[PDB]
From a paper:
The Carboxyl terminus of the HSC70 interacting protein ([name]) is an E3 ligase that blocks the ATPase activity of HSP(C)70 and tags substrates with ubiquitin for degradation. [name] has three functional domains: a tetratricopeptide ([name]) domain for binding to chaperones, a coiled-coil domain, and a U-box domain where ubiquitin binds before transfer to a substrate. Both co-chaperones interact via the EEVD motif in the C-terminal tail of HSP(C)70, making this domain a significant mechanism in chaperone function and a therapeutic target. To understand the structural interactions of [name] and [name] at the atomic level, we completed structural studies of the [name]-[name] domain of [name] (21–154) with either the phosphorylated or unmodified tail of [name].
Although the new structures of [name]-[name] with [name] peptide and pT-[name] peptide are globally similar and nearly identical, key differences are observed for T636 and neighboring [name] peptide residues. Second, the position of the T636 side chain in the [name]-[name] [name] peptide complex is not available to pThr636 in the [name]-[name] pT-[name] peptide complex because this would place the phosphate group of pT636 in close proximity to D134 of the [name]-[name]. If this mutation is made in [name] with non-phosphorylated [name], there is no contact between N132 and [name], so modeling predicts that G132N should not affect non-phosphorylated [name]. Due to the position of the N132 side chain, removing the pT636 phosphate group would not result in any steric clashes; therefore, the EEVD tail structure could return to that seen in the [name]-[name]/[name]-SBD or [name]-[name]/[name] peptide structures.
Author numbering:
A (entry chain B): 640 to 646
B (entry chain A): 23 to 151
Write the structure that this text describes.
Amino acid sequence: PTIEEVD
Amino acid sequence: SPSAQELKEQGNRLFVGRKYPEAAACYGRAITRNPLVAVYYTNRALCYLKMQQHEQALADCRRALELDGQSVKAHFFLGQCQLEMESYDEAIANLQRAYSLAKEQRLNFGDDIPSALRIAKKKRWNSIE
C-alpha cells in the first residue's frame, strides 16, 4: 500500500 | 535468457535496493521482450525521477498513458515529475487525476496521494510569494 513504488 | 516478467522483477528488486540505473536497464530489457506493457514504463519512469532525469521520466509516463489511460501511477509519477520541474498547475491536476482514478478503482494507498497533493499545493503557493 505505497504510491511511490514499482509494480 | 530471462523472461520479460523475470527482468521486471529483477528490476523491481534492484529498485528496492536503490540501484536505479541498474533497475531502469532491466525494465528496458523487459520492454524489448514485450513493449505493450504499461507497468514497465511506469516502473522505469520512477527510476528516472530518482535519477533526476525528468525529461525521460516524462516520456515514459506518456508511453504508459498511451497504453493504459487509467493508470493511477502513470498520472501520479507524471505529476510528481512536473512538480520537480516547477510545472505546478499541471502537477496538481495530474495528482488530482491520480486520486480520482484510484478512488474509482478502489485502490488503497491510504493518505499518500492527498499528502502529495498538499505538498504540491504548498509548493505552488510558496513559489508564488
